[PDB]
Amino acid sequence: SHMEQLKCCSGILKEMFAKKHAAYAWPFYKPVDVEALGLHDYCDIIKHPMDMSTIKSKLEAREYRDAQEFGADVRLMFSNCYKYNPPDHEVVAMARKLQDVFEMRFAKM
Ligand SMILES: Cn1cc(-c2ccccc2Oc2ccccc2)c2cc[nH]c2c1=O
């Protein structure tokens, strides 16, 4: 069922926003501030930005047909982070930690 799928998707995102994962999930909470220092080239490299607050709104506006569509946006958020940042950056390690949480939950549904 697509409706049951989307309720599980809202549940997965709720855990990603939870205090349990807050120490490594916080840079993905809100859109990347492109006006901040060191982020002047962010829009040149990242054509499709995504964050957890935009995903939360997209679920609430019913912009996802199914779990795969929600999954594609979550992975876009992680891929943007791996594409923009150097492999040794602190935020890359945090993206991997949060992706481990998402992937385990997304697979077991
Ligand atoms: C997804 N994301 C997010 C942030 C970010 C956005 C707001 C505040 C901190 C951010 O990052 C941290 C910088 C230092 C320590 C931990 C994280 C960023 C910065 C450069 N690249 C990114 C990025 O790709």
Where residue 47 sits, what CATH number does that domain have?
A: 1.20.920.10
Phi/psi for 19 (5° steps) reads -55, -30
For residue 17, what are its two tokens? 């926003």
Number of domains in the chain: 1
Residue nearest to atom 9 of ligand 1 (CA): 27
For residue 32, what are its two tokens? 């990347």
Give the Å distances, CA to CA, from 16 to 23, 31, 65, 86: 11, 15, 21, 23
Domain that holds residue 18: 1-109
Question: What is the b/e burial string over 68-78, where b = at least 16 CB atoms within 10 angstroms of the residue's CB?
Answer: ebbbebbebbb
Resolution, rounded to a tenth of an Å? 2.2
User: Obtained via which technique?
Assistant: X-ray
Distance CA(109)–CA(26), nearest Å, equals 25
Handedness of CA 61, 12, 55, 53 (dihedral sign): positive
Element at 10 (helix H, strand E): helix 2-16
**Do 86 and 31 contact (CB within 8 A), yes or no?**
no
Q: Which atom of ligand 1 is nearest to the CA of 77?
A: 1
Give the Å distances, CA to CA, from 83 to 5, 58, 62, 102: 29, 23, 28, 19
Distance CA(70)–CA(107), nearest Å, equals 13
CA dihedral 79→108→67→3, nearest 10 degrees, is -160
Ordered DSSP codes for 42-107:
HHHH-SS---HHHHHHHHHTT--SSHHHHHHHHHHHHHHHHHHS-TT-HHHHHHHHHHHHHHHHHH
Helix axes 2-16, 67-84, angle to 10 degrees: 30
Site to substitute for ligand 1 among 91, 92, 98, most atoms within 8 A of C-beta: 91
